[PDB]
Amino acid sequence: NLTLNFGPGVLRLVMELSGEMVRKCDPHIGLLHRGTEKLIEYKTYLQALPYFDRLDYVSMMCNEQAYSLAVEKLLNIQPPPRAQWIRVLFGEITRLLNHIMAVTTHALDIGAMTPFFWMFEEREKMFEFYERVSGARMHAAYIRPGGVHQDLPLGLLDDIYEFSKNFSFRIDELEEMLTNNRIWRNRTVDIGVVTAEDALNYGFSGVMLRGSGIQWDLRKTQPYDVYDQVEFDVPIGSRGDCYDRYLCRVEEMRQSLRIISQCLNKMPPGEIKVDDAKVSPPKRAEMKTSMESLIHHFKLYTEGYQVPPGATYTAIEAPKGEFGVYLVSDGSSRPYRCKIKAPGFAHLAGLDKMSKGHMLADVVAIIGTQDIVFGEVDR
Amino acid sequence: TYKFVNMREPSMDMKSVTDRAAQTLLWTELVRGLGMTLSYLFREPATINYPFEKGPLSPRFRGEHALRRYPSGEERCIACKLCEAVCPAQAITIEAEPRADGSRRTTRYDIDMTKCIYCGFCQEACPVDAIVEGPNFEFSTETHEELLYNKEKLLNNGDKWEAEIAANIQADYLYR
Amino acid sequence: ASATRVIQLLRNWASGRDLQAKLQLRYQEISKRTQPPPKLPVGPSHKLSNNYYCTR
């Protein structure tokens, strides 16, 4: 029984092995603990928004939406319909980015590196969409607790449509490389099997549930924004292993394309942030012409808006699973407490059970199928 | 509604079993993957010829910071400290006093570029469009010290980039 | 795409799909980088009367 400390995303893993078998796997984390939750207590809500971009870096837009939903619930306001549609469209784009990252990396670690490049070209195109809508490629801060910061430029919808009508062929090429390959199946089939009861008790969420046959998806069960106005299917696994989760993720990307199509065709007119200048800042022209607009701009950018006292737990169906925020407001313009719930935390806590009686090389596959991003896990 | 990803049962007739045996022995799907790679070899690559060719950008893109001025040549900044107040990283340091002619102007305006997160909150909090995030992104440095911008550096950046900055603002200001 | 017909046929046969219909390289089909100005309408609270803040 030999003990190996595979040290330095960045992960330290202490294992005891009996021969080739993995007897015990112990992850040591905190190599990316930056104390986000303590730092948030020294910021206004607007000032605290950009930390959520950095929490789960792979899918920045979704974290913005979760934080904005929590703050909106505490504020007792609702965003305008066009803002909600933009939020859902960019959340599905965000899902595609996360899925491409998760699938390609899983394949790359497994030793297949070709689809990483093939799909990172598409990732670059989606980064272009991000940059055109917000000015930043990845750390966007676009989705705000009153709606969105800016309206779409006049040619963005057409370019998104042009991109999205060619992506299914890219997914088909990825599948041609992966799904029926016997080496890929031997690397993934019957690896990291988790039962439904164990997945529920261990706090798993997202695909980590749906690969075991659990029919659960927050966008269907507890819809937020306009997800109740779009039609899509929830892919469900049957064996609870890595292969079924890969299929579910691939299927999810196709579903995301479907939802993006619906969002494009049903984008409504109107304003992009709530018409309430005590929450959302006014327009520049109004700020430079009206006394009330200038006062509200000054106060919203110096003190910030006050949130009525209370605590909420708001969760959304993130690309990596259920992503949640427990937000406690004391009545001032700075949050009293912000606890961030990350799906990867519970998934990595379950890695020990998932890797019981497997090869050392199976641990890499299980880590890849758990979809672990370190920034969210450590916070 | 929901979908099954892996709920297919293989056929057990002799023809299907022989097809699967032929796949097992003659390596058919591996040849399919080889064909996919071969097809990808013969298409045009997506590489651009940097630095002679550049990636696409938007008027909304946020780059190196700059301090702008009015067409008369007087600076726009009136030392309200709204950008300093809103800065999520506390990267802005401002000190101000009345000028020799009584104007409300800054004597110190520093941005720690190694603390900045390039969020652009300062340029949207500014009431007079004084601090902006200009289009330049190629300003890497050999030392940490040259990334601690004072007021002179930011005014020089503004005078250097004003043409492009004003064009970008003209393009994007109707969205703000 | 500036590809010869023979190379297009070879890549189409190798992949098993028609590549020309769905190309992964952008061309003139994308929107112009210079756009007309927008107008950006106002929200529901921009009324001149019957708009007391205590009711919203």
Binding site: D151, N180, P269 | - | -
Partner: peptide
Amino acid sequence: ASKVKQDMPPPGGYGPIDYKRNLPRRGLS
């Protein structure tokens, strides 16, 4: 005077977008 102009889908909507898996069988017994 001038009417509203923002980014909207074209009249009649956009064309259909493929999303189903396409893995054709080349064909050989």
